[PDB]
């Protein structure tokens, strides 16, 4: 029976999971995989060697945590099933795959081997009878209510500026250059290497990401604020020590708009989005110039969208209505948008049923996902 | 500058136009302003024919796609299967 | 001037150049602008760094190669001049502009501005005393020796069907589209973007174009060969990196027949060619059926002309004897005809002298071009 469907947002840095109808995915944790470091000899430790959530956050430097979804490329399939199982566990779902429908998420340009591989999971290992998987940008559109908007997500290593029109993302205009703050924080670790600090452990790097999400912003003036002398704000170490910040809090995110700092032939999100704009109807661009759909977790900086506004001003001509539509519960905005989509009743068709998967599998999906 | 183009095979093309123009030249002498008046007519002919030549392109895209688009707004493909499936966008859009 | 006249095979993807009498262009290297990618440190690091040819193909991963001839139209004018200086150099010409006669070639439907700007170069920077800007299709007719032929180029950003009559085409029945293997190969890479291959550099894309010229063809049956599951033959990079091919090899050239894959406001270059032929008299169309000339480089696919034949059979009326000439130097056919016309000393009247430019600029060319 089509029970309460589960909206599972597979965000790059943080995966989200919760039943539809709800407003908060009660079962969330970041997108990682945590295996231990040492060998517990005495008891009093946990068992399973795959510790997620409070165990992971608890045993941070005790676990040699890793990350499966690498710019939308996940490879820990079996452990992914165990992650879902961790959600399927008494901790988070307490239910079965067969019992409740599943609303899973996606990103563009994904290899159908991996997509159908996930279908093998939820139809063979797990046995979801009502599983539908789709983009997260449309979910953000449900949240904003806008239908003709250019959605760009901001995760940890995923940034796809997708221009959508009335719920129809033009594939010829869809832009997917999934790379974000992952290497920015890695380059900040390089700053720390140029400061004498290594964060080669993921948990060691998790603290870097915590301060990254915490003590960082977007200095709208790039070289002006870059050439000025920073103050090197002493930020507390988690043990109780304290270390400076420097330009890094704004100097490292300059790489987002200036990909050449890492040495990458890219153009900066704004220009990529302008390229997406170029591949459309001229009149619709003016709407999209004002239909600035912000999304993703990395859209949490001071002067973030305003520096982006300056980028647009350097890109868009005069008498162009520019209008940022920033959300607030960004990653959950897509999750709640999925709660809206999963609540639909016409929605029962294109989801691959279990028998539908038994029919062809691959082409049944190909035709039902397209 | 009256025009009457009458093509008819497999689609009638009865194209008719003109160019109501009024200039005002100064008459000095016969042969002096003769070629001048002819030059005015000449330039209006050349200019209007040039305008029409440009009109082929501007109408070819502007007028055409203005009335009947060439490609859709997305310009990709119209798959009525997915369109009828789920009521592809009348929910929010 | 009493010197061997220079023939300039203005190839979109692969530009060429040479002289009179010869059958193969004396100096061949494609149309591109290879700008650098790093900063010189060690004494031994070359300078100028915008290198072409051996250094380009040699250090593909070190040169940010760009392309000026966009849509068959050069955008890096000054840089193309320097590329001609590269030709003027010890490598190719070892002479001056003022010494040898020069012959420039052109595609149909070209804006006057390009021709004018080129003449500015030719008679101001370069100072050729014997030069005129000719066509390209009639040159392929010189190569074939035919009179009433339809010339179809096949480059990278240009595609034109030129119904010619004795070397004098109706400058109205000619059709021209500025797209070929550039974005087609980019779209093939886009197919691989789905399966994880967004190797963005143009030199990195040059390898993709080597596959385009190498592992690509045209399957006559569209859906009967596309919808089925392939074998995914493998490809090996300069290091030998295993990459499968699949159906993409013939899926991507369908864009030239189905512009809806990119959303281009074209209707299939094959239908455009049919329309180019259909803008003449029925008997003249018969003469053009008897003489179908192919040019450029993209005329080298399996089932290329065969699928074209099938399309003409399903579109053109009965008795259309599609007599397609299939030579090998289709790229050089324009160069061959340029060497032929260069051997024709009647060009004295056909050229534009330096003083002719001094008195007319490019107006003389516009009065003499056809
Ligand atoms: N305050 C913040 N600053 C920077 N990045 C953030 C912040 N909050 C969340 N993020 C980024 O978003 C990631 C989680 O977002 P995710 O669900 O991956 O978004 P998306 O769905 O856009 O990929 C985190 O790993 C982090 O990198
Ligand atoms: N063997 C081949 N197979 C398929 N395509 C080719 C082959 N050789 C060349 N091409 C295509 O032809 C292009 C060469 O451009 P060119 O034909 O010189 O432009 P033009 O049509 O102006 O002469 C290349 O960009 C390439 O994509």
C103: alpha, beta or left? (left if phi > 0; alpha if psi -120 to 50) = beta
CA C7/CA C158 separation, integer angstroms = 20
For residues C190, C193, C197, C198, the Cα torsion angle rounded to the nearest 10 degrees is: 70
Would you say the CB of residue A156 lies under 6 angstroms from ligand 1? yes
C-beta of residue A49 within 8 angstroms of C-beta of residue A36: yes
Please tell me the distance from the alpha carbon of residue C336 to that of residue C137, in angstroms, as a whole number: 11
DSSP reduced 3-state for C331:
coil
Own/partner pairs for C343-349, CB < 8 Å, 24+ apart? C343/C20, C343/C21, C347/C5, C347/C101, C347/C103, C347/C130, C347/C132, C348/C130
Nearest partner of C370 among C166, C154, C144, C186, judged by Cα: C166
Which DSSP letter does residue C122 get?
Answer: I
Q: Are A246 and A232 in contact (CB under 8 A)?
A: yes
Q: How many CB atoms lie within 10 A of CB C7?
A: 32
Ligand at shortest distance from the CA of C215:
2
| Closest Cα to atom 2 of ligand 1 | A213
Beta carbons of C59 and C38 less than 8 angstroms apart: no
Phi, psi (5° rounding) for residue B57? -70, -50
Distance CA C299, CA C151 (A): 12
Q: Which of B71, B76, B77 sits opposite C265 (nearest CB)?
A: B71
Residue C276 · residue C163 · CB < 8 Å: yes
Question: Are the CB atoms for C101 and C347 separated by under 8 Å?
Answer: yes
CA A42 – CA C278 distance, rounded (Å): 88
d(CA A158, CA A181): 9
Among protein residues, the one whose CA lies closest to atom 2 of ligand 2: C213
Three-state DSSP class for residue A106: strand
User: Contact C196/A73, CB-based, under 8 Å?
Assistant: yes
**Cα A316 to ligand 1 centre (Å):** 27
Lateral strand order in the sheet of A6-10: A27-30, A14-19, A6-10, A102-106, A131-135
Which residues neighbour A223 within 8 Å (Cβ) at sequence distance 6 or greater? none
Using the Cβ of A73 and the Cβ atoms of chain C, whether some distance falls under 8 Å is answered with yes
Distances (CA, A) of A34 to A51, A121, A185: 5, 20, 20
Give the helix, strand, coil percentages of chain B, each rounded to 5: 50, 10, 40
* Closest to A356 measured CA to CA, from A107, B80, A348: A348
CB atoms < 10 A from the CB of A241, how many? 8
Given the DSSP bridges, would you call strands C16-18 and A235-236 parallel, antiparallel or unpaired?
A: unpaired
Beta-bridge mates of residue C64:
C35
The Cα A117–Cα A131 span in angstroms is 13
Residues in chain B within 8 Å Cβ distance of C263: 71, 74-76
Chain breaks of chain A after residues with C–N above 2.5 Å? none
Helix-then-strand count for chain B, H and E:
3, 2
Residue pair C295/C153 in contact by the 8 Å Cβ criterion: yes
Shortest alpha-carbon distance between residue A141 and chain B (Å): 9
Residues of chain A with a CB closer than 8 angstroms to some CB in chain B: 141-142, 145, 147-148, 165-168, 170-172, 281, 284, 344, 346-347, 349-350, 370
**In which residue are the tokens 């709660």 written?**
A339
Task: Work out whether the CA dihedral A15, A19, A25, A29 comes out positive or negative.
Answer: negative
Token readout for C323 is 């007599």
Nearest residue (CA) to ligand 1, atom 27? A156
CA-CA-CA-CA dihedral for A197, A199, A205, A210, to nearest 10: -10
Contact criterion met (CB below 8 Å) for A74 and A67:
no
From the list C300, C311, C305, the residue with the least C-alpha distance to C258 is C311
Give how far Cα B13 sits from Cα of B7, B9, B70, Å: 5, 8, 21
* Angle of the A269-278 helix axis to the A304-315 helix axis, nearest 10: 50
Nearest CB neighbour to A265, from listed C195, C196, C201: C201
- Give yes or no for A112 touching C (CB within 8 A): yes
Compute CA distances C16 → B34, B65, C9, C19, whole Å.
53, 39, 5, 11
What is the rounded distance in angstroms from the CA atom of residue A33 to the CA atom of residue A318? 48
CB of A213 closer than 6 A to ligand 1?
A: yes
CA distance C189 to C210: 12
A1 CB burial (10 A radius; 0-12, 13-18, 19+): exposed
β-pairing, C150-152 vs C63-66, is unpaired
A246: left (phi over 0), alpha (psi -120 to 50) or beta: left
**How far, in Å, are A23, C151, C175 from residue C277 at the CA level?**
63, 10, 9
CA B91 to ligand 1 centroid distance, Å: 29
Is C230 within 8 Å of chain A by CB?
A: no
Query: Resolution in angstroms for this experimental structure?
Result: 8.2
- What is each CA distance from A263 to A193, A259, B39, C45, C207, in whole angstroms? 18, 6, 63, 19, 20
Euclidean distance between CA atoms B54 and B60, whole angstroms: 10
- Supply B93's token pair: 């859009």
Q: What is the DSSP string of C209-228?
A: HHHHHHS----SSHHHHHSS
Which DSSP string corresponds to A191-257?
A: HHHTTT----SHHHHHHHHHHHHHS----SSHHHHHHSPP----EEPTTS-EE--TTHHHHTTHHHH
Instruction: Give me the residues paired with residue C179 across strands.
Output: none
Alpha-carbon distance of B53 to B61, in angstroms, equals 13
Strand, coil or helix: what is C336?
helix
CB A178 within 8 A of CB A287: no
Closest CA to B92 of A175, C247, A248, A337: A337
Q: Cβ-count burial of B91 within 10 angstroms (0-12 exposed, 13-18 middle, 19+ buried)?
A: middle
Q: Which residues contact A27 (CB under 8 A, 6 or more apart)?
A: A17, A18, A87, A91, A92, A93
Determine the Cα–Cα distance for residues A104 and A338; give it in Å rounded to an integer. Answer: 9
Q: To which H or E segment does residue C7 belong?
A: strand C6-9
Q: How far is CA C305 from CA C159, C217, C300, in A?
A: 14, 10, 9
How many beta carbons lie within 10 A of that of residue B90, not counting itself? 10
> Which chain C residue shows the shortest CA-CA distance from B75?
C263
Q: Report the C-alpha gap between A317 and A335 in whole angstroms.
A: 35
Q: Do B92 and A142 touch (CB under 8 A)?
A: yes
Going by alpha carbons, the residue nearest to atom 19 of ligand 1 is A155
Structural contact between residues C32 and C79, judged by C-beta atoms closer than 8 angstroms: no
State the DSSP string of C11-69: -SSS-EEE-SS-SS-SEE--S-EEEE-S---STT--SS----THHHHHTGGGEEEE-SE
Alpha-carbon distance of A28 to A54, in angstroms, equals: 11
CA atoms within 13 A on the CB side of A264: 19
Q: Which residues of A touch B82 (CB under 8 A)?
A: 350, 370
Radius of gyration over every alpha carbon of chain B, rounded to an integer in angstroms: 24
Chain-centroid distance of CA A15 in Å reads: 7
Reduced to 3 states (helix: H, G, I; strand: E, B; else coil), residue C197 is coil
Distance of alpha carbon A74 from alpha carbon A67, whole angstroms: 8
How many angstroms separate the alpha carbon of residue A298 from the centre of ligand 1? Answer: 4
Q: Is the Cβ of C64 closer than 8 Å to some Cβ of chain A?
A: yes
Chains that touch B (3 or more CB pairs under 8 A): A, C
3-class secondary-structure state, position B53: helix
Report which DSSP code applies to A71.
S
SS3 assignment, position A260: helix
Residues of chain B contacting A145 with CB distance shorter than 8 Å: 92
Give the orientation angle of helix C269-277 with respect to helix C282-290, to 10 degrees: 120
Q: Which of A163, A166, A288, A369 to mutate to test the interface with B (most CBs of B within 10 A)?
A: A166
Which residues have CB under 8 Å from C304's CB, separation 6+?
C217, C218, C253, C298
Ligand nearest to the CA of C338: 2
Angle between helices C181-194 and C202-214 (to 10 degrees): 100
In order, the DSSP letters of C228-291 are S-----EEE-SS--EEE-TTHHHHGGGGGT-GGGTT-S---HHHHHHHHHTTS-HHHHHHHHH-
| Nearest residue to C162 via CA among C183, C126, C137, C127 | C137
**Could you tell me if C15 and C31 are in contact, meaning their C-beta atoms sit under 8 angstroms apart?**
yes
Which conformational region is residue A113 in: left (phi greater than 0), alpha (psi within -120 to 50 degrees), or beta?
alpha
Choose among A163, A135, A141: nearest CA to A288: A163
Which is nearest to C13 in space by CA: C195, C222, C185?
A: C185
The beta-carbon neighbor of B74 closest among A141, A145, A168 is A168
Check if the beta carbon of residue A213 is closer than 8 Å to that of residue A300: yes
Domains belonging to chain C, first-starting first, are: 1-136+334-368 (3.30.420.40), 137-178+267-333 (3.30.420.40), 179-266 (3.90.640.10)
The residues, any chain, with a CB within 8 Å of residue A113's CB and separated by 6 or more, are C195
The Cα of B82 is separated from the nearest Cα of chain A by a number of Å equal to 8
**Quick one: closest CA in B to C255, which residue?**
B76
**Both tokens assigned to C229:** 């599951």
3-state secondary structure of A306: helix
Alpha carbon nearest to ligand 1 atom 1, residue: A213
Q: How far apart are CA C112 and CA C119, in angstroms?
A: 11
Beta strands in chain A (DSSP E): 6-10, 14-19, 27-30, 33-36, 63-66, 102-106, 131-135, 149-152, 161-165, 168-169, 235-236, 242-243, 292-294, 324-325
Ligand 1 mean position to A216 CA, how many Å?
13
Residues in contact with ligand 2 (CB, 6 Å cut-off): C 11-14, 153-156, 158, 181, 209, 212-213, 296-298, 300-301, 331
Q: Residue C183 CA: which ligand is closest?
A: 2
Contact C369, C142 (CB under 8 A): no
- Burial of residue C229 (number of CB atoms within 10 Å: 0-12, 13-18, 19+): exposed
**Closest residue, chain C, to B61 (C-alpha):** C265
Two structure tokens written together for A273: 């989005």
| Residue of C186, C188, C194 best to disrupt the A interface, most CBs of A under 10 A | C194
Smallest CA–CA distance, residue A166 to chain B, in Å, is: 5
Give Cβ neighbours of residue C297 (< 8 Å, ≥ 6 apart): C11, C13, C14, C154, C155, C156, C181, C213, C330, C331
């Amino acid at each position: 029976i089509a029970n309460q469907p589960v909206v599972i947002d597979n965000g790059s840095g943080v995966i989200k999971a919760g039943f539809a109808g709800d407003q908060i995915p009660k079962y969330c944790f970041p997108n990682y995989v945590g295996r231990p470091k040492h060998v517990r000899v005495m008891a009093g430790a946990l068992e399973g060697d795959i510790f997620i959530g409070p165990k992971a956050e608890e045993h941070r430097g005790l676990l040699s945590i890793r990350y499966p979804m690498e710019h939308g490329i996940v490879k820990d399939w079996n452990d992914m099933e165990r992650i879902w199982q961790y959600v399927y566990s008494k901790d988070q779902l307490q239910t079965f795959s067969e019992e409740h429908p599943v609303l899973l998420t996606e990103a563009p340009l994904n290899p159908r081997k991996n997509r159908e591989r996930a279908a093998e999971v939820f139809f063979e290992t797990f046995n979801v009878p009502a599983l539908f998987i789709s983009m997260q940008a449309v979910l953000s559109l449900y949240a904003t209510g806008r239908t003709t908007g250019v959605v760009l997500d901001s995760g940890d290593g995923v940034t796809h500026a997708v221009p959508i029109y009335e719920g129809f993302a033009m594939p010829h205009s869809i832009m997917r250059i999934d790379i974000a703050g992952r290497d920015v924080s890695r380059f900040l670790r390089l700053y720390l290497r140029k400061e004498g600090y290594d964060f080669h452990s993921s948990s060691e790097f998790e603290i870097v990401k915590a301060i990254k999400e915490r003590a960082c912003y977007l200095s709208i003036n790039p070289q002006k604020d870059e050439t000025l002398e920073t103050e090197k704000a002493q930020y507390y170490l988690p043990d109780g020590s304290t270390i400076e910040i420097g330009p890094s809090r704004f100097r490292a995110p300059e790489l987002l708009f200036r990909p050449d700092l890492i040495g990458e032939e890219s153009e900066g999100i704004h220009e990529v989005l302008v390229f997406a704009i170029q591949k459309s109807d001229m009149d619709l661009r003016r709407t999209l110039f004002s239909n600035i759909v912000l999304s993703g977790g990395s859209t949490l900086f001071k002067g973030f969208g305003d520096r982006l506004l300056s980028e647009v001003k350097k890109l868009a001509p005069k008498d162009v209505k520019i209008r940022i539509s920033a959300p607030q519960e960004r990653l959950y905005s897509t999750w709640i948008g999925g709660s809206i989509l999963a609540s639909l009743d016409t929605f029962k068709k294109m989801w691959v049923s279990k028998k539908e998967y038994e029919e062809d599998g691959a082409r049944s999906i190909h035709r039902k996902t397209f | 500058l009256k025009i009457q183009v009458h093509y008819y095979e497999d689609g009638n093309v009865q194209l008719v136009s003109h160019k109501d123009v009024q200039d005002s030249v100064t008459v000095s002498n016969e042969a002096q302003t003769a070629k001048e008046f002819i030059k005015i007519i000449e330039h209006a002919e050349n200019e209007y024919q040039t305008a029409i030549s440009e009109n082929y392109q501007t109408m070819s895209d502007t007028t055409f796609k203005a009335l009947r688009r060439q490609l859709p707004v997305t310009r990709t493909k119209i798959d009525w299967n997915k369109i009828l499936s789920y009521k592809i966008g009348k929910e929010m859009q």
